[PDB]
Subunit: 342 residues, 4 copies
């Protein structure tokens, strides 16, 4: 019995595990200076069609927090959404890594920032009493399962230029957004004005690690020193970089993302039209956000269905992963149908 | 006439009591960093004034004083609960987060510039999971940034909640004087008798050149605070010039005379104008500021001899602020021009 | 093949690979709340013979830096040796993690602090101009391959208690110290007064991760929040904790350490009676420190041997790992004889 | 008779500072630097240093140096200082707090002074990611042991800093004493010799509170006002930090107070360095006299009513003269040294 709590509970996929076994034969130089790390970096430059600089941190909390700290001073501020992971789920790590850059929440719409909600935040305060906004962060796919599209990104970068702002992307679930859309990685990042991407691996079948991709190379000066000082330098770096070889060499990363997307779409197809069940947001990645009644405690007691419930408390989230079985999706949907109609 | 506007009580000068104390203190050589007669003398007056054995420190300004006090009350992986209009949130260029190394400021709902036990509980109970920094402090401002005052009963309620939730309670008393004068309470009744643990007591705004007193009523919380301040660049070499002015202000009641004056000036203005049509007082005048909804005639009062004052990022709302040295006649001139303008 | 630069270049030992394989069957709850993490902590508790609090971080730099930041405030100081890793190899990580606690170097005989060298540094500075010392960190085995003995530790501990200092152990090479002396782990830590131990895993055959053991559970208050904010919290904690189960269940940790020690003791035995070659320190762990003449170049770059050279001209350090073959040792000692004799 | 030789930090507010504060206390004026006194001070600083330097005020020298160093490199970079540097010995770890972890690396010093060689020693042995990369050099002028960098010593440090990509900061807590002694222009002791940033002490030379921070390289001062604000170092009532500089700078008073304090230290040392068992530990190039003495110094200390800073214990004794030091009291102190040792 697997569950729908989160894609952090999934295991290592076979291509990641296979890269790791290959990387475990021999001795190799530490701290980045190895063949596996240069191969993964080469793959990243080709995938994104650019000479991006590539770094590897241990988890997404540190990767986001480092990236942002490199994009502005402690006396500047960072514009994010209200559901942003850097605002809700990192126990104040950005502020620790930045030595006090304020996160200013902007209004959002479908989990997404807009040009107007940014400007409303930035321009309310170019006075020294306020840390001057200098960075926008967006999550792709968002924390509520939605996806910024290329033109929405460009509109946001446009505001970032009117206002002086760098643009960071938390791509913890970037794959899900690439699977969903036709796009190439480049059209979803630097072609649309993205300065830096944090590209999640852990959630897409890896044991540990995130990649950080600087598309403006002037912003990446000495980033390796920052990472070391912040305790984010793997000595046995191949075991962070090798799985990215596995996942990128013939498109497995994007297959695993389509799978997880298809499971969540299937779940929503099966349940979103029942009575008393409202889809909170369109299913554009691997999550399903349902308003339901006291049937959550029934779906919860009635078999250990494991899933997250909001403090909104008339609301539940189901997350699908690369290793989710369609049959389990149908079984979950069936139990939801039973519990509502009966 | 005249240099004196209605923009900020931070444009006022050094009052005579503060100046006279600095001059006396400028007679001889004394030892540094707190080990002088003036600093001990000032601490005595604070203990006497607050009726308790509070520990006393001096910093250079309110931003550091608040930022130091809050950092001493919880870890970087804990959070601070404040109002949406708290100076620590709006006016300190992120100093609290710098001084604490990353304590998140969590804003709670405000009724009349004030937090309630309810708004504190709501923020606090949503964040027991490790994804959020755990709340460990509530900060309140007295008088508040919209010129309202918390009453001892309002404070006791907050203090109970903080004690139920394991929260320390910090008071930003940049305008503490204005709240004591208005209510007529004792300082002790507006701080530790209602459960305040640490008070930042502003001097600058009420007639000093520089300097803010930090008072720890809960002395477990003050261990090594002097090292914290030193490392933070907040230790005066010539400490007598921070502490002597508090002897000036406290020996004979001048601090409250100056606060009552600024309050009475603010109250006058509101009396003179709050009955005119198209002029709403947004908040009771419980300290030294006046908050008026008016029409686009802000430019009218603004252009008219360049009354200087603050507008909000809001269209038709203005803030007039009085200090220890505001002349009542300037207030009368201002209220007059406000009336002329609205009746024309 | 394999070199003598650092025990950081070695791979994942078999007991640890196996544990990760078993831990990769199924889904598990995140951020520490899994059976592997509980099992690992139980092994530590039995192994050290005490109810110690157990945490996992990603590497030794963060682990040390985290433990030390938890033992004193930013306006306090830490007493460490001049060769301490926290002073030389961490790109200022301790100061970053502690928000500015000063590291005060005390004098070392044989890579080791003494009660006297601690006292000198601590009493010199009881005035506010100086951050007040509040922690002693020692390294076990030390950075020069020596080992503190239970009696030396107890002595250092008596000083710490008298001066109100906490005692931290950087045990990046703790296995080597235990293998060598034959003591119980308890006898080299809490029975001798150690408050906190950073227990190296990466160096003894893991891909990633260190264990942090608090022997005073009150000092561990909220360490989990500290680690989370610092970006040191694994989402898939089982892949940091299961390898510890593998290394500890049947005694592999200590076997792997005796191996690395024996190879290093062999290398020194083979070359010690040579004329131009002097052993700078007793071989008490897995490193050999040799003063020989700048004909280290004929060993080095020349025949392709890899090893670190001390900032002393012709100061070479040779490091043996869990997977060092005795034949490569006998080879290295043979080439050293050719270059010296002829 | 409260007049001692422990520290020029115990001195009072001088008349030119006091009179300037008095003039500034007439009216209302806008806060946080937007002020007639702050602009006048800045113009005096620019004329005095013969250049278009950007001017800031902070509350004290610990913060002034810590802020200046923090703007000159990143937390994962390092600062090269001397073994006697105030930032290393006297600031309770403030540099590291303000920079969020920049390592202070000490370099070998002779007579309180860094040299191009000792800087180079440190900077070139710290070249891989294990070590925070050096990015700044700080020097103190006058130094912590009462000596002075000569313009030519400063040019040579600057040349080494330019070659190594290092910025150059100057802790001028006692800058007045160095200018008074050497007869150089301020420009010749700062930016003509390569200095990027000066912290110019006012408190030690007759003010109540405050330091000036001068950026000669204007690019390095970007957003420095925001850094100061976040660090708790922005005066609401800025006129009371900047007006005393108007008083000190408008007609020479700063140097006159520096020469007085140096001449008083020169007299003290003149009158006693010929006694036996009494030795000057360093040249008297500012307002300090460092004397190696006999433990019986305790009788100068003792019940003689003399305060001064005993070294580690008991060898050294350090004496410091101030703008308000009385020559007579110097002659007294030297006479009481004279007796005690003449028996
Ligand atoms: C949207 C988002 N960003 C970043 C992270 C950080 O992920 P982690 O620290 O578990 O690798 C998560 C969990 C996430 O959901
Ligand atoms: C409510 C409140 N708290 C603190 C401060 C900080 O004062 P300062 O300008 O002296 O840093 C102010 C201005 C304030 O209005
Ligand atoms: C003695 C010592 N302690 C701690 C560490 C930190 O190890 P890591 O390289 O895994 O950050 C090392 C490398 C070390 O040699
Ligand atoms: C050489 C030096 N630099 C900086 C300072 C800091 O001065 P303050 O005590 O005003 O913080 C002092 C006292 C000093 O002697």
């Amino acid at each position: 019995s697997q569950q729908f709590a989160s894609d952090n509970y999934s295991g290592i996929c076979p291509e990641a595990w296979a890269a790791m076994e290959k990387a475990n034969h021999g001795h190799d130089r530490a701290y980045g200076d190895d063949q596996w790390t240069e191969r993964a970096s080469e793959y990243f430059r080709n995938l994104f069609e650019t000479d991006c600089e590539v770094f590897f941190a241990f988890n997404g909390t540190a990767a986001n927090s480092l990236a942002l700290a490199s994009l502005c001073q402690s006396y500047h501020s960072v514009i994010c959404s209200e559901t942003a992971h850097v605002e809700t789920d990192e126990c104040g790590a950005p502020e620790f890594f930045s030595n006090g850059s304020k996160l200013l929440t902007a209004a959002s719409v479908n989990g997404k920032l807009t040009p107007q909600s940014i400007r409303e935040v930035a321009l309310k305060r170019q006075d020294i009493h306020y840390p001057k906004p200098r960075v926008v962060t967006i999550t792709q796919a968002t924390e509520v399962g939605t996806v910024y599209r290329p033109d929405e990104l460009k509109a946001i970068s446009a505001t970032c230029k009117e206002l002086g702002l760098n643009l960071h992307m938390d791509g913890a679930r970037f794959t899900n957004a690439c699977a969903f859309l036709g796009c190439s990685p480049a059209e979803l990042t630097w072609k649309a004005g993205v300065d830096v991407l944090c590209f999640g691996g852990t959630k897409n079948g890896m044991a540990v690690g995130e990649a950080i991709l600087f598309f403006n190379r002037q912003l990446a000066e000495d980033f390796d020193y920052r990472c070391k000082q912040a305790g984010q330098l793997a000595s046995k770096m191949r075991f962070l970089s090798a799985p990215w070889v596995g996942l990128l060499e013939d498109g497995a990363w994007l297959r695993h993302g389509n799978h997880a997307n298809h499971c969540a779409q299937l779940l929503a197809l099966l349940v979103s039209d029942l009575p008393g069940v409202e889809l909170m947001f369109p299913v554009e990645a691997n999550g399903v956000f349902l308003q339901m009644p006291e049937h959550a405690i029934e779906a919860l007691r009635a078999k250990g269905w494991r899933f997250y419930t909001f403090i909104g408390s008339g609301g539940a989230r189901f997350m699908c992963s690369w290793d989710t079985e369609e049959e389990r999706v149908r079984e979950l949907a069936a139990d939801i149908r039973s519990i509502i109609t009966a």
